[PDB]
Amino acid sequence: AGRFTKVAAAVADSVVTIESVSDQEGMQGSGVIVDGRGYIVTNAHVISEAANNPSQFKTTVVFNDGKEVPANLVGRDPKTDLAVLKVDNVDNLTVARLGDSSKVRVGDEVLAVGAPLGLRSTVTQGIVSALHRPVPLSSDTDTVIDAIQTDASINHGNSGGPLIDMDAQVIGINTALGFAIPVNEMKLVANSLIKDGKIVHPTLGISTRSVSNAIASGAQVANVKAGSPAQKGGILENDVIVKVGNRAVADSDEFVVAVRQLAIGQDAPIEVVREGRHVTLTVKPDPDSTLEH
């Protein structure tokens, strides 16, 4: 048995197919079992149609053995492209080993595993090419995440499945040369989605475009929402944000990720370049959902 064949066979029982079918459509995806009580993690874009139109879509989970079981949507987070499903009263479940994405290094060999019984499912192999790489993702909203970049091929055949290290541990969730959501970030989102059915992210009310020159490189403020924390913090248009809190901002993509790293209700510093002068501002991030939270 090969080195990668052993690893792929080890986690095959913990990867499932996710089928969402209507009267005229259908779409498949991959998921991973992360809890013995029947909790399955995929990415939010696999089950987007069933979430926005639940009166016409049925979501089932197909196992490695061939068992087909109905599933229930616990919650989803479009801003991190994550979602949690639930299957009821299924015993002898093979739960996946969840690793620590903070221990992943550049050059580590990985497997991008899709569901074994998927239609066009794949299993690709590569290494970790970059860590903490902001990447944008296209009725769901557009988002930007820090991703574990890998030269293993991510496609519709292994999207939603796990990114696996050589210990058969899940270090990421494959998404959309290929990118995966870190498992440490996935644990935070999934733990909140199981508990409350929702996730609350900070907001500032800013639109930014990218800029890169000798004066200042970063995220240039393109808009300020009325009554937003940035409006009450003194942020103006044409400002060039270079630091959000404790993280330097290289472009609009890193800016979106840096805002999510902030704490809701706590004062945070913002460093901008206004008409050639470096100005330090202070904002209090609002929750994107005030009723949840």
Add this chain to the structure above:
Amino acid sequence: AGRFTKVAAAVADSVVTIESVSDQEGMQGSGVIVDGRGYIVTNAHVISEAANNPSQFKTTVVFNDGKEVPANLVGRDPKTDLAVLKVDNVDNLTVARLGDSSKVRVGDEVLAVGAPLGLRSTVTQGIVSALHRPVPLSSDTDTVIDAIQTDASINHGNSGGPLIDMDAQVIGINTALGFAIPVNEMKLVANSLIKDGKIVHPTLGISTRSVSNAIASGAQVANVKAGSPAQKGGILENDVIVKVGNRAVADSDEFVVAVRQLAIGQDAPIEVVREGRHVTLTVKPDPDSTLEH
């Protein structure tokens, strides 16, 4: 010497360049020596122009040592994209180790080897991503095969060459993220092409389009040829074929492959969904070439 360098050097002498040149055109490809009597296996699309227009095309085989030798087309099978060439009176030939594609597992490391002296020839490396994956291939006819999907790059530089395991054994023929024809299927086609110069595949006289919903997912009958076995079997238009013989049919691609698995002249069951009712039919497949057969 590296692990892959050792394997690539082991099979280099059994991979050849295939040159087809005319008064105004030329195209190169790769082949593999599978028999000491001078039998070379490539895919049918490398030598398509020389087969359809033999009065103007010359087909030569270039070896690893640099020897250029004229070749003769034994036979071809467009429906599996396979062809067999013949070189006469060449001694001390390095015949390739033919493996067993039924022993190949997902995750096995592979090499996609092209001819060493090819112009734009390549040698790519990857793993097996999927097994028994139906895949469509574009004056030759379009076909669909079960393929050994691999994340090793298949291109014009290694097409027609062998897919190689870590024992330097041929497990597939590279074709056209990359796909290869299984060696077990290649042995069946090549053994018949050497014996009779032809291959006879079953036919039903059906055109199908794909369909995927909650009622029924499979291959929807788009046409029925007059006097075809499907016409004498009771298959109608708008039927949704879900099982051809002993193989479930997920789409039109798997349907085309499932028909080739049938036996000519033997009754076979067909399961369709007609106006919401599951109906089991019986057909007797005809030979596509009645004079050969």
Add this chain to the structure above:
Amino acid sequence: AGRFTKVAAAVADSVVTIESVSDQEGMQGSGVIVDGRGYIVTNAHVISEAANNPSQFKTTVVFNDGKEVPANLVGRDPKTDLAVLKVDNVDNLTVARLGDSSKVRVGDEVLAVGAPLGLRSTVTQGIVSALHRPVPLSSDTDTVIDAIQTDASINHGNSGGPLIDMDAQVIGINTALGFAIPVNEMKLVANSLIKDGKIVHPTLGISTRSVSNAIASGAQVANVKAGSPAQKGGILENDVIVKVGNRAVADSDEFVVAVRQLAIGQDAPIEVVREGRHVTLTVKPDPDSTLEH
């Protein structure tokens, strides 16, 4: 620690980011430290804008530790896509191990390393797919090089960085399924660029287009410059060059590379096919820069 993680960590200190910024633009690239006196090698297309417009572009080098240091353009060679930078008075530099590209074999595992602190920098892994492969490269002029073809991904994230063997030795410079400039060729160009600030390549004054048929395959003369060595050597239009000196010419790409292998001022044979007759001609290559040379 993984096998590739160990190699990537070994050379990380010898790979640098190269930043060229103006009042309205900016572009990043990768380089490699090849000499303790502060000599950095990248490819010519990373610093093209700063070379052609030095009055408006500033070129800085960012190190692994985060140090940003101004850089000076020693010289560039568009015909091989190579350039040498210089940093002054920087001690404790980690100089990269330079290997021997003539000892590289097909199948050898390689790493394509980009600068660690680059914005969209990558580290991809693959094998060597082909050696001595002519490949064309797009106000700089178009060129063709022999390259170490690899199935590791080369992109804007690791372009200009080193191609690394399993001994953490530089065997190539990543450029532009992926290609790299051999380290042996890089040493020749860099040694001349450091010494004289320039590189002198042979010229013939010929334009060629590709041709591949049964009569003759090679580079067909499309133009002859007035007073060129080819004009004084008897080369005519519609000639089909098949051998430049001691190297056979398969197309226009190999022809461009074969000319650079010639010696300036020394008689060299040219074999053409003129109206069906093989004719052997003799040319004396001129220097492309007569004042340097």
